[PDB]
Amino acid sequence: RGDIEKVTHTGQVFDKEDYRNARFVNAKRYVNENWGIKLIEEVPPKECTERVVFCDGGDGPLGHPKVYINLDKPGNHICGYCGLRFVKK
């Protein structure tokens, strides 16, 4: 079984010499296959024209609170709530 030696997205796995792998001989280990890091870097950054942009989660009242991100600094600016990346050319 490979779920015992599988690593979660928080970087946790039990060692081979650990006694705590004896709890998994009768119940399988639950490791989430959808890591949030890979699915947030799969989303491409959004190119914007304005100096500041607003983010609200993409759902309105069902997203995160609306925050404003400055884009005058070059590079990719990451929203601290949802992880969407904005960029200004």
> Interface residues with another protein (CB under 8 A)?
8, 10-12, 14-15, 17-30, 34, 39
- What is the Cβ-side half-sphere exposure of residue 17, based on CA atoms within 13 angstroms? 0
What is residue 67's three-state secondary structure? strand
Nearest distance in Å: CB 25, another protein: 5
Task: Please classify residue 81 by burial: count the beta carbons closer than 10 Å to its beta carbon, then call 0-12 exposed, 13-18 middle and 19+ buried.
Answer: middle
CB 9 within 8 A of CB 29: no
Per CB under 5 A, contacts with Zn ion among 30-89 are: 55, 79, 81-82
Nearest distance in Å: CB 61, another protein: 15
Nearest distance in Å: CB 68, Zn ion: 11
Select the binding partner of residue 18 from Zn ion, another protein, none (C-beta < 5 to 8 A, by kind).
another protein
What is residue 46's three-state secondary structure? strand
Residue numbering of the annotated binding site for Zn(2+) = 55, 64, 79, 82
